[PDB]
Curated annotation (Swiss-Prot):
The keyword Signal applies. Involved in regulation of length and mediation of adhesion of type 1 fimbriae (but not necessary for the production of fimbriae). Adhesin responsible for the binding to D-mannose. It is laterally positioned at intervals in the structure of the type 1 fimbriae. In order to integrate FimH in the fimbriae FimF and FimG are needed. It is found in: Fimbrium. This is Type 1 fimbrin D-mannose specific adhesin. The chain holds residues 22 to 179 of 300 of the full protein. The lineage of its organism: Bacteria, Pseudomonadati, Pseudomonadota, Gammaproteobacteria, Enterobacterales. Keywords: Fimbrium, Signal.
Amino acid sequence: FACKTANGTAIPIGGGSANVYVNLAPVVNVGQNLVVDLSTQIFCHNDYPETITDYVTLQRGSAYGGVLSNFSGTVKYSGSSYPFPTTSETPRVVYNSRTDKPWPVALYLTPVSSAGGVAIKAGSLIAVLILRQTNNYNSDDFQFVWNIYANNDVVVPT
Ligand SMILES: OC[C@H]1OC[C@@H](O)[C@@H](O)[C@@H]1O
């Protein structure tokens, strides 16, 4: 089991970390969602599907910088929605194929009443997502740490 980014940055068997740089909608109104769909940028696969079933959860998702200050976060993991920042580990998603499958993580961020102006700064860390991988074969318990950075400013009209 290993993961790779849309651009080819890989975290190999055993886990590790990698940076993910996402384009964000440049203007988000109060009452709208800024969506950070990471399933288009994080892909993982099972290396031994003939024998092993891998289990994948979103163990923890943390908010930083402007997302922490200016947004109210919900994370949608494999079709279900949970608070973001997270308050529990998600259920497992089964990875049972050697073909790359998107990691089904999307963030839904809506501005708070106090938000206005440059609510997210270009190049800033906006989230850290911890993917936890286990299996039905051994005691493997690995963390793939995704640091999410904003490629651009996000302005909340005032
Ligand atoms: O993906 C199948 C297996 O690949 C080897 C090792 O990463 C295991 O943890 C994993 O379950």
